[PDB]
Design a protein around this ligand. Structure first.
Ligand SMILES: *[C@@H]1O[C@H](CO)[C@@H](O[C@@H]2O[C@H](CO)[C@@H](O)[C@H](O)[C@H]2NC(C)=O)[C@H](O)[C@H]1NC(C)=O
Ligand SMILES: *[C@@H]1O[C@H](CO)[C@@H](O)[C@H](O)[C@H]1NC(C)=O
Lengths: 43, 50
């Protein structure tokens, strides 16, 4: 488990908090991200 | 007339304190649903200052 998405529609129409922890780098953004139909991170 | 400054004119509910709404969804003010298209009882939520 490496992150979280918070919002209302999660489809680039509103602002959605995105938290990702990749290895040693915690990344926090509040952009209007365009998420995939089934968001995931590959290895 | 400077028309770059806008303000929200319609919203289904009042903002909570320190809430920021920048959505431009077409406001449905009548019983007929709006499909994202401006028109009768279907408002663009932002108005421009004079
Ligand atoms: C925050 O967003 C939610 C939806 O993501 C808003 O809930 C909507 O409230 C209106 C009434 O004002 C209902 O007609 C909608 O059906 C609700 N949406 C859902 C998905 O149930 C909520 O009002 C928003 N908060 C504020 C303060 O505007
Ligand atoms: C984690 O992702 C951010 C951008 O999302 C990137 O800048 C950073 O370098 C990444 N960290 C690693 C260890 O790859």
């Amino acid at each position: 488990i490496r992150g979280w998405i918070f919002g209302t529609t999660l489809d680039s129409k509103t602002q959605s908090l995105l938290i990702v922890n990749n290895a040693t780098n915690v990344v926090i953004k509040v952009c209007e991200f365009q998420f995939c139909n089934d968001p995931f991170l590959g290895v | 007339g400077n028309y770059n400054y806008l303000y929200r004119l319609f919203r289904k509910s009042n903002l909570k304190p320190f809430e920021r709404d920048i959505s431009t969804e077409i406001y449905q003010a009548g019983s007929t649903p709006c499909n994202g298209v401006e028109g009768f009882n279907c408002y663009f939520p932002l108005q421009s200052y004079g």
